[PDB]
Write a protein that binds this ligand. Sequence first.
Ligand SMILES: CCCCCCCCCCCCO[C@@H]1O[C@H](CO)[C@@H](O[C@H]2O[C@H](CO)[C@@H](O)[C@H](O)[C@H]2O)[C@H](O)[C@H]1O
Ligand SMILES: CCCCCCCCCCCCO[C@@H]1O[C@H](CO)[C@@H](O[C@H]2O[C@H](CO)[C@@H](O)[C@H](O)[C@H]2O)[C@H](O)[C@H]1O
Lengths: 167, 80, 77, 186, 54, 55, 558, 87, 102
Amino acid sequence: MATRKPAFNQHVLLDTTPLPDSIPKVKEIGASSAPLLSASFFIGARCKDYNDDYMQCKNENPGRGEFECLKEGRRVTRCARSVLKDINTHCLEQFRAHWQCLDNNNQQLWQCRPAEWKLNKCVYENLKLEKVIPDQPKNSTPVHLRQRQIFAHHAIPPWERPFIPGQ
Amino acid sequence: VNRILFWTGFGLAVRFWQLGIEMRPFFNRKSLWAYPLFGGVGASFGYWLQSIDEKQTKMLEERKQAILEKRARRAQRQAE
Amino acid sequence: TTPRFWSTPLKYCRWAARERPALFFSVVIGALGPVTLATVPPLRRLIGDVDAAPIPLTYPIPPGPRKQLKGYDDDTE
Amino acid sequence: TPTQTYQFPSKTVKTDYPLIDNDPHFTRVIRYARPSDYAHGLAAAAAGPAALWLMERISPSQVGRGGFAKAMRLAGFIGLAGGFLYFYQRSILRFYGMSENAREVEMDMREMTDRVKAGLPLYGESRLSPAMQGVAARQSRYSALFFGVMPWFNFVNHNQHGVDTAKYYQQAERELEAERLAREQA
Amino acid sequence: FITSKIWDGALAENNHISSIGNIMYTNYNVWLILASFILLLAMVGAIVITIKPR
Amino acid sequence: SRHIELKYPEVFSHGSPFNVPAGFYPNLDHVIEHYRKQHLEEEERKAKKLAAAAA
Amino acid sequence: MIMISILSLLLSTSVTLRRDMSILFNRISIIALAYCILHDTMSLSFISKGIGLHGGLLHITNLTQIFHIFIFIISILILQLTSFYPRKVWIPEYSSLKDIFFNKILYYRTKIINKMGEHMKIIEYPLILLFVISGAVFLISTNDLVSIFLSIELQSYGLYLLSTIYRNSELSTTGGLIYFLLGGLSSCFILLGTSLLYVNSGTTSLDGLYILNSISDVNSWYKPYYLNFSLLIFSIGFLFKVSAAPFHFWSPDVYDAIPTIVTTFVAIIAKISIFIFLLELVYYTNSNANSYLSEFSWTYALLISSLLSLIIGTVVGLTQFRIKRLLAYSTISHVGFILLALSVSSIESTQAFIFYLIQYSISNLNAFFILITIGFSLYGYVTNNKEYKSLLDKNNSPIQLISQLKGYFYINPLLSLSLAITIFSFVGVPPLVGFFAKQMVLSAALDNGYIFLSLIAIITSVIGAVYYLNVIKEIFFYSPEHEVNPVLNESDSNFSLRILNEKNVLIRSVLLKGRNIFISSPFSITISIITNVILLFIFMNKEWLSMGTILVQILFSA
Amino acid sequence: NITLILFLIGILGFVLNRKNIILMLISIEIMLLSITFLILLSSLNMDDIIGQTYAIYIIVVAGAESAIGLGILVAFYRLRGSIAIEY
Amino acid sequence: ASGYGLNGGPSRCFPFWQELLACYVTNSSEDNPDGKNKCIPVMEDYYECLHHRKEAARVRALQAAYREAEAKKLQENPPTAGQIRNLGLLNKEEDTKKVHCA
Ligand SMILES: CCCCCCCCCCCCO[C@@H]1O[C@H](CO)[C@@H](O[C@H]2O[C@H](CO)[C@@H](O)[C@H](O)[C@H]2O)[C@H](O)[C@H]1O
Ligand SMILES: CCCCCCCCCCCCO[C@@H]1O[C@H](CO)[C@@H](O[C@H]2O[C@H](CO)[C@@H](O)[C@H](O)[C@H]2O)[C@H](O)[C@H]1O
């Protein structure tokens, strides 16, 4: 349906008709909004190739990319299901600590640094994955690693240390 | 007619009309330099119109040849 | 009494700073913007204060041919 | 070779001479100006102040004490304004191909090839976004042609200049292959 | 009328005034020039036809 | 002329650079090859004109 | 350069309140317009139907630049009216180069030259014309609907301000009020038309609309009926602005009420920009293929306007006794010829359209200069007629009645023949230039099937020639009601003029009477250059007509 | 449909007015509010920001005509003492 | 046609306009008068995107067929809104089976 923001919507139209059997089925991602943001940098550490291939297939075939790019989308939802599966297998406590933080912090990442750094510790140890933000400035500390967050509502205690991969 | 001749005279005619409209005397000695100045501007404008004429002639020549290709090339493709 | 800018440029500027301060310093501040554009940015590049890269405001599609991935296929499901 | 020398759709204008650039940078326009361009700009610039002084002598204004000095200043600014626009517009029409530009085609070919072999971006590096570079380029392409109504100048290092840049790369390649043989010979 | 969500087009959504601003001062800036001159004419002209100078 | 030539062929480069969905913009290299041919033909005509009439 | 000129002049007039400083700001407005002519003159080294500039919101064309320069020169000639005093004092003792360049003349010039006259005191008058000119040269080069709207308003709003600038005249303020209130309604029509264009096409670019019309013109769910309906509303507003009947009742009233200096500018400049813009719009909205699209062609409103303007303009002018109302109606009959040439879209009609517009703008200018100069001439004359005593704004419009021109041949014979040569050009009598304009428009119409309109046009040309001859009969067939001022030549009445030298030492004193006061040279020379062009065109026609043949060769090329 | 009705109101202000040069001032602005309002509602329909911008510039030109219009009406009133039309 | 939409992104019917501009510029010239006749269906799609008349016509008959096709068939047990609102929820499997009639 159209991408226009709605102004006078009062009803929802659901279609219970299933996808045809011709198209291979895929189990869908079941993580909610905050679990996805906690695992967002892990997913793009692993599925970036699949995530970029899917967006390229769609760009390659204009106006016809919802169809004709269906196999690639199933590949992305399997890569991301393996990250979400892997985090629960090893870092469940640290993961839930961080995403439950983000629930009460407007899902703003700078507001839960002590929880994120511990999750980054556990995911790097257990899954060898690392949070990387591309093209960050070169003359200063990365924002996601700073001991002080100016826009944080609560101060980061000094004993909570940012996770540097190797120290 | 000659352009340099017509425009030189046109400047001399413009001086005569201006004195007639002002009702000032034509030909007083201490103001006769006006006729050479008006004529020289008439000479100069006309050397500029000759350059305009030369270029327009090239352009109209080219165009009449282009219309003679379009009419020709179309007839060539209609022979099939 | 009150000077004339084009006869005495420096002497007018002192009178205007003293006698028309809000008006004089308006033209001063307005000129500082044009100056600050001209001056600080080259000095910033002298001290090594590199301008930050732009943030992405669209999906960042990489250039080149598609990579021909293998993995996460229907059989793996 | 970037495999794409004509990367953007550009307007072809029917002119009598080769195009060097749709949108020359301001410094290239200044730097290619021939010494006649300076005489003509100065000549036009002095004309508005001198026309105004000429009129006052022949047909006096009968104005008060300071009025003509004020007017001389304004006629003088307009002369520096119109004088510089004419000087710039005279140089930049050789870039557009609307004036005989044999000299500047050689100076363009040399510099642009000397840039290729130095690894430099052909038209320099822009602090602006590729999209803001494309807006800038669409605003300034052939804009000296609208100078009598509106002033505009290029101060952005975009790479949209209306020309197929294969020739600069081709000539760099042929020049590199010439120098390499000389070094191998001796 | 039916509507549905999009994700690639909802990355950094802009309010209508930011969208007008993204283009009002760059791509269509000639419209700003003419308008600046229409307002400037309505200043000079309306002052000159009403007030007694000095 | 029943054919219109765009005075601004640079509208093919128009469009927002932000919040672009994959596949939204069309593949217009057939357009860019048109304009490339037009620039190369015009460069040739003048080349063939002020080089064959300069001797 | 027009924009650098407005800002620099605005800053200078913003910090001054001196009214003696207006004559010099008008001289700089003439020098300013000369640099613009040097810039557009150098922008004419290319062939193209057009180049879109500044993001496609503007375009440049060979026809666009020529008209930009024509606009600037017509502007430089009207500006002379406010840049030089109306009369001068000349003596053969001060007439050589050494004198006019190194010697000086001193006398009491105030009452001779009308130094503190009204037209010599407004300081913003040179600036307001420059903002009108800006809107005109933008309208010529508009490639977008918004650009058209913003340009037409820039030109329209400045015309209203020019018509209200004599703030102390009940007539002038009345005319500016009529112009704004009927002009604002015309703008709604222009805005309605453009809005309905974008709302049906999704585009504000003219070239996209031209292509949507190009693809439709082939001999199902989306008929493009809007283009011809939108452009018909759109042309109604532009018909009002050029005063074509039926929307013409405003011009006779506004042109007679505002001062004559002002009616030179307002009654010329708006037509030049509006008619050039319409020509490009008519060329690309043509229906080459006879389909249902051409049945609702918007060009029919111009064909009906031209027919109505030919009749109204020539019939209603028969009973006018006010000269400026007469000239207002004469302009309506000339737009009936301009509008027919535009409506027939052919190579011959466009060349005849281009000639008619330029030569008519040049000749009606002479009709305005001759009128203003005759007004200034009667300073040394007096009259006892009881009707002239009761005229209003006798200073803003010195000549108001056609009867005030009785016996002018007796006062000034060559000024009377300049007004004769110009009026006979309006009639269309050979060998005068205005003949060769109506000849081309009639030949274009006859060649393409407009025989019915041609016969109407030549009929009304006889009718319109009746009120032109009434002006000629009034200037030459009678004796003047104006007598020389007796005091100016009293034998005892003389003004002392001092000839100095470079170091301000008397060279001579001279005694001068009213016989030593003349018209100023800028006015006399301008009149003689245009009267000569009208009278000698048959010997100097190649460059002017060839420019038009090349210009229409490109617009129609390919 | 509201846009067309409100356009009629401005038209009908010209139909019923023999004496109010002020209502002629008013109805021109009602007509401008129709055309701007129509442009805006079609812009929402086509997801275009240029319709919004074109409305903005109509609003700015509309205010400027009010300044020029009320300024000229002041110049007229100073010498007249009445905005009335004798009829 | 502009390319700029309300949310900062591109306009919805801009792809159709470029598909229409590309067609006309690459198929129609002065050499070929009818080349622009390939732009007819491409222009229809552009006019359809902006206005949606043919889709409105299509969805106005299809909706008239279904509404009187589902007006005469027997109804077994219409699912209530509360049941639909529990669809796909991890602790309401009973309601989802009722909705999908599986
Ligand atoms: C009554 C009719 C009124 C018509 C009003 C408009 C008239 C326009 C007349 C000017 C036409 C163009 O006139 C032109 O000016 C330019 C000024 O650089 C010059 O043209 C020249 O331009 C460049 C140099 O700048 C050269 O490379 C070019 O080869 C040459 O043509 C010539 O002088 C003349 O060809
Ligand atoms: C009383 C009336 C007297 C005559 C008044 C009119 C005279 C001036 C008319 C000049 C215009 C026609 O003359 C010609 O037109 C063409 C097309 O516009 C232009 O021609 C120009 O473009 C070409 C094409 O690239 C350039 O190579 C050429 O150098 C340049 O001059 C010039 O403008 C002029 O050379």
